[PDB]
Design an enzyme around this catalytic site. Structure first.
Site, PDB file in Angstrom:
ATOM      1  N   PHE A 163       0.824  -1.198   0.000  1.00 35.65           N
ATOM      2  CA  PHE A 163       0.000   0.000   0.000  1.00 35.65           C
ATOM      3  C   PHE A 163       0.867   1.261   0.000  1.00 35.65           C
ATOM      4  CE2 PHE A 163      -3.960  -2.116   2.111  1.00 35.65           C
ATOM      5  CZ  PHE A 163      -4.146  -2.848   0.953  1.00 35.65           C
ATOM      6  N   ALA A 164       1.924   1.254   0.809  1.00 31.34           N
ATOM      7  CA  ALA A 164       2.773   2.424   0.975  1.00 31.34           C
ATOM      8  C   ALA A 164       3.513   2.806  -0.313  1.00 31.34           C
ATOM      9  CB  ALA A 164       3.737   2.206   2.118  1.00 31.34           C
ATOM     10  N   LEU A 165       3.998   1.803  -1.047  1.00 34.74           N
ATOM     11  CA  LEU A 165       4.522   2.009  -2.406  1.00 34.74           C
ATOM     12  C   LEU A 165       3.523   2.659  -3.368  1.00 34.74           C
ATOM     13  CD1 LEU A 165       6.478  -1.304  -2.948  1.00 34.74           C
ATOM     14  CD2 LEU A 165       7.486   0.980  -2.790  1.00 34.74           C
TER      15      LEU A 165
ATOM     16  N   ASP B 279     -12.714  11.361  14.667  1.00 35.44           N
ATOM     17  CA  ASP B 279     -12.200  11.448  16.023  1.00 35.44           C
ATOM     18  C   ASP B 279     -12.941  12.549  16.744  1.00 35.44           C
ATOM     19  OD1 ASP B 279     -10.170   9.862  17.421  1.00 35.44           O
ATOM     20  OD2 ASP B 279      -8.907  10.170  15.653  1.00 35.44           O
TER      21      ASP B 279
ATOM     22  N   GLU C  77      -9.162  17.623  15.784  1.00 36.98           N
ATOM     23  CA  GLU C  77     -10.017  16.453  15.926  1.00 36.98           C
ATOM     24  C   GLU C  77     -10.343  16.185  17.376  1.00 36.98           C
ATOM     25  OE1 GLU C  77      -6.268  13.279  15.296  1.00 36.98           O
ATOM     26  OE2 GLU C  77      -8.265  12.865  14.487  1.00 36.98           O
TER      27      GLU C  77
ATOM     28  N   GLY D 111     -10.252  16.329  11.537  1.00 34.59           N
ATOM     29  CA  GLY D 111     -10.408  14.891  11.686  1.00 34.59           C
ATOM     30  C   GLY D 111     -11.779  14.586  12.246  1.00 34.59           C
TER      31      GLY D 111
ATOM     32  N   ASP E 166     -11.057   3.458  10.082  1.00 36.99           N
ATOM     33  CA  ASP E 166     -10.030   3.125  11.080  1.00 36.99           C
ATOM     34  C   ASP E 166     -10.521   3.238  12.527  1.00 36.99           C
ATOM     35  OD1 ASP E 166     -10.101   5.857  11.431  1.00 36.99           O
ATOM     36  OD2 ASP E 166      -8.026   6.193  10.784  1.00 36.99           O
TER      37      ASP E 166
ATOM     38  N   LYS F 186     -10.723  -2.922   3.738  1.00 37.53           N
ATOM     39  CA  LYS F 186     -12.071  -2.810   3.184  1.00 37.53           C
ATOM     40  C   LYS F 186     -13.038  -3.728   3.934  1.00 37.53           C
ATOM     41  CE  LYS F 186      -9.891  -3.533  -0.575  1.00 37.53           C
ATOM     42  NZ  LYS F 186      -8.468  -3.848  -0.938  1.00 37.53           N
TER      43      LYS F 186
HETATM   44  O1  LIG Z   1     -11.170  11.785  11.150  1.00 34.08           O
HETATM   45  C1  LIG Z   1     -10.205  11.353  11.751  1.00 34.08           C
HETATM   46  O2  LIG Z   1     -10.063  11.234  12.969  1.00 34.08           O
HETATM   47  C2  LIG Z   1      -8.940  10.863  10.819  1.00 34.08           C
HETATM   48  O3  LIG Z   1      -7.770  11.242  11.215  1.00 34.08           O
HETATM   49  C3  LIG Z   1      -9.090   9.885   9.613  1.00 34.08           C
HETATM   50  C4  LIG Z   1      -8.429   8.973   9.459  1.00 34.08           C
HETATM   51  O4  LIG Z   1      -7.438   8.807  10.042  1.00 34.08           O
HETATM   52  C5  LIG Z   1      -8.815   7.842   8.475  1.00 34.08           C
HETATM   53  C6  LIG Z   1      -9.981   7.487   8.371  1.00 34.08           C
HETATM   54  C7  LIG Z   1     -10.388   6.423   7.472  1.00 34.08           C
HETATM   55  C8  LIG Z   1      -9.424   5.792   6.715  1.00 34.08           C
HETATM   56  N1  LIG Z   1      -9.503   4.746   5.769  1.00 34.08           N
HETATM   57  C9  LIG Z   1      -8.282   4.502   5.311  1.00 34.08           C
HETATM   58  C10 LIG Z   1      -7.504   5.247   5.854  1.00 34.08           C
HETATM   59  C11 LIG Z   1      -8.279   6.110   6.796  1.00 34.08           C
HETATM   60  C12 LIG Z   1      -7.874   7.238   7.754  1.00 34.08           C
HETATM   61 MG   LIG Z   2      -8.143  10.705  13.626  1.00 35.89          MG
END
Ligand SMILES: O=C(O)/C(O)=C/C(=O)c1ccc2[nH]ccc2c1
Ligand SMILES: [Mg+2]
Length: 708
Positions: A122-124, A447, A419, A444, A618, A606
């Site tokens: 994924f990182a690549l 959160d 956030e 964010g 996440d 997913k």
């Molecule tokens: O809203 C937040 O608190 C935030 O920092 C978002 C995420 O970190 C986030 C969410 C969903 C994701 N799906 C893939 C990667 C990813 C990352």
């Molecule tokens: Mg977050």
């Protein structure tokens, strides 16, 4: 066993070896002055870290009390918060002073990609997602409706392909417009005397704005490709009639390549499950590969060379400018423990170790070929902060790691996440605290919803999870973010960012709706894939962000009263069925996420919801769900009997919706199931509703009980 002795610290051997043999060489830093610096910094800074966490808890408890002791008067709630230091006064206006920042952040506007750093594959791809095919993204997703004729089967569908091509032609027209005609009638491309001429069937034309012509490859008469530019983002038209898609095209075009993910965030936080030194070393090794340029599984694309509209030979960066997202101030990790055996603050560790590592992104050749920042900065996202004193503390922490590493002061730049509520209602003070290291602010929202729910847990039941996105508090919060960044002079200096689109399969919906973020003046927004980055690149060609920002300055659109509006549900809000559904919904979301975390150490993937609508979310989502259910429990909406029935019900479906070990029908043997239960049941006791303590503990439990 496997601990090394450095001063007051007992470092895990795997970590000690990795840093020594892998991270340090080439950094021109004595492998002994470093660890001393680790020891010193840990010793000297651990106090304040622990004091700030105590501040959170003290504050949280006064708020828990004020609500327990009973309506809801806004002016009272506001005075109280001021009284307790929660709601600090707003500083005088100012402008940020950050420098040494790359153009991808100060100037460009475009999608930002977040990928879990423990997944090199994924990182690549994420690093390689600076450039992406628009044909792929349109053809592979439901942006082009799989109606009839256009169905997507095992082989290439010409009708669907024509549909893609038309979409891309219409995009070209609306981005780099012709003075006369339309790209959809074009028959050829040549470059003659620095201008670009499009061969129409009846004549020729140039671009209306000829300056949007950025370059080309191959001979000027039969160009391999033609490079366009709109809104500081590049468009590339691949020309090859010889090709499959080429022959079918009226101008022999194989593809349209969009400059997509301008930046990427390599993640150590909510998208990864890393509970030990073993886990952290993997992500560390990947971040090193990324910073050197040699990460392989499939390799990092090198830069792209072009001919300027005249003859000169310029080059464009092939990769996304990389950030690293360190963890926040809360957790500890046993990768390092002190003499008494206490775990060391993981946040401080991330700073020392991701900073060290990023030195390679600054230098090319011999002990890595590839350079991240052209300007000499190290970009770090700092999540989960509560108030300006925690921002300040992160500054000081960076100031010290730099000293240990020998970098100029202010090398390590900070990406501030908005956030947490206490950050939100004090954002100007948070930005002022980081005035010379701050490269973005970003909402964010997930959160943020979590903290919102936990901060007012003792006030009453919250509205449902789906109802949150429309709430007065979160719409105020989104705009307030933009006013503060713009006030502090983010325009032409720092990014102004918004949240993630988790509905990974619903791309047409994204393309239709995610446009709102730049329309609100955000120069960047989050996507969870290289493809969704390409599709979200379209919006930036549609929306001039520089201008929206320009005509938004001076304005204040949120009041503190609007921010402080608690998302409480009204009386008799929900029928019995809408509750059962919301309960099942959160239990399945919690179950399907936790099961992959504990059992397999996957922090982001997913995962299909109740209806198999795949969501890539996440820990923030988990923090929302578990806190929501916890809140309904606390306030009568549902019972403890209800939660268990829902968990018990959803569990076998999650199993069938999924190497994998089934939670059903043996519930109190699956540590994952017991984790998901704990998360809900212990929910109100977790500090700030945070989901990591339980999760980390339970993952470590799984790791142990599987060794034999
Ligand atoms: O809203 C937040 O608190 C935030 O920092 C978002 C995420 O970190 C986030 C969410 C969903 C994701 N799906 C893939 C990667 C990813 C990352
Ligand atoms: Mg977050």
């Amino acid at each position: 066993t496997d601990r090394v002795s450095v001063g007051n610290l007992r470092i895990a051997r795997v970590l000690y070896d990795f840093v020594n043999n892998e991270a340090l060489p080439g950094t021109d830093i004595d492998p002994d002055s470093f660890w001393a610096g680790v020891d010193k910094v840990v010793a000297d800074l651990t106090p304040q870290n622990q004091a700030l966490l105590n501040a959170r808890d003290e504050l949280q408890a006064q708020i828990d009390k004020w609500h327990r002791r009973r309506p809801i008067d806004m002016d009272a709630y506001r005075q109280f918060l001021t009284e307790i230091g929660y709601l600090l006064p707003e500083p005088d206006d100012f402008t940020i002073t950050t420098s040494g920042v790359d153009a991808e952040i100060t100037t460009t506007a475009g999608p930002q990609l977040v990928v879990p750093v423990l997944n090199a594959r994924f990182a690549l791809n994420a690093a390689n997602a600076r450039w992406g095919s628009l044909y792929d993204a349109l053809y592979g997703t439901d942006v082009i409706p799989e109606t009839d004729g256009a169905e997507k089967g095992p082989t290439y569908n010409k009708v669907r392909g024509d549909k893609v091509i038309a979409y891309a032609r219409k995009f070209l027209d609306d981005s780099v417009p012709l003075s006369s005609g339309s790209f959809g009638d074009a028959t050829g491309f040549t470059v003659q005397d620095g201008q670009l001429v499009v061969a129409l069937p009846d004549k020729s034309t140039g671009l209306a704005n000829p300056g949007q012509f950025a370059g080309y490859t191959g001979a000027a008469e039969s160009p391999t490709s033609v490079l366009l530019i709109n809104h500081g983002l590049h468009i590339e038209i691949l020309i090859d009639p010889e090709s499959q898609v080429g022959t079918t095209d009226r101008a022999g075009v194989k593809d349209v390549i969009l400059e997509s993910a301008i930046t990427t965030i390599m993640d150590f936080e909510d998208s990864v499950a890393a509970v030990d030194a073993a886990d952290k070393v993997l992500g560390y090794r990947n971040w090193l590969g990324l910073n050197k340029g040699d990460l392989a599984a499939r390799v990092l694309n090198r830069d792209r060379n072009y001919t300027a509209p005249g003859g000169g030979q310029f080059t464009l960066p092939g990769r996304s400018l990389m950030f690293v997202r360190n963890v926040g101030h809360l957790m500890t990790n046993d990768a390092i423990v002190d003499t008494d055996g206490s775990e060391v603050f993981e946040g401080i560790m991330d700073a020392l170790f991701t900073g060290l590592i990023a030195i390679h992104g600054l230098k090319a050749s011999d002990v890595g070929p590839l350079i991240n920042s052209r300007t000499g900065s190290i970009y770090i996202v700092k999540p989960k902060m509560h108030g300006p004193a925690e921002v300040a503390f992160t500054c000081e922490l960076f100031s010290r790691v730099e000293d240990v590493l020998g970098l100029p002061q202010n090398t390590m730049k900070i990406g501030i996440m908005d956030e947490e509520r206490r950050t939100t209602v004090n954002l100007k003070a948070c930005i002022k605290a980081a005035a010379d290291r701050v490269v973005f602010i970003n909402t964010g929202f997930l959160d943020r919803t979590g903290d919102e729910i936990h901060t007012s847990m003792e006030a009453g039941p919250m509205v449902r999870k789906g109802t949150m996105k429309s709430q007065p508090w979160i719409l105020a919060y989104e705009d307030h973010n933009v006013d503060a960044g713009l006030a502090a002079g983010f325009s032409g200096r720092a990014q102004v960012g918004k949240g993630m689109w988790t509905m990974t399969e619903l791309m047409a919906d994204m393309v239709e709706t995610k446009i709102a973020q730049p329309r609100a003046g955000a120069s960047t927004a989050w996507v969870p894939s290289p493809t969704a980055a390409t599709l979200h690149a379209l919006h930036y060609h549609q929306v001039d962000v520089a201008a929206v920002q320009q005509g938004l300055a001076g304005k204040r659109r949120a009041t503190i009263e609007q921010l402080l509006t608690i998302p409480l549900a009204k009386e008799l809000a929900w029928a019995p069925d809408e509750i059962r559904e919301e309960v099942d919904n959160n239990c399945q979301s919690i179950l399907g996420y936790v099961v992959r975390w504990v059992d397999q150490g996957v922090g982001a993937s997913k995962v299909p919801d109740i209806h198999d609508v795949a969501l890539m979310e996440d820990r923030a989502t988990l923090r929302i769900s578990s806190q929501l259910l916890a809140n309904w429990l606390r306030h009568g909406v549902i019972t403890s009997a209800d939660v268990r029935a829902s968990l018990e019900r959803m569990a076998p479906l999650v199993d069938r919706q999924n190497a994998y070990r089934p939670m059903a029908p043996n519930f109190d043997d699956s540590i994952a199931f017991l984790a998901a239960q704990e998360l809900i049941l212990s929910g109100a006791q977790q500090p700030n509703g945070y989901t990591e303590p339980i999760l980390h503990r339970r993952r470590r439990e799984f790791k142990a009980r599987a060794a034999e």
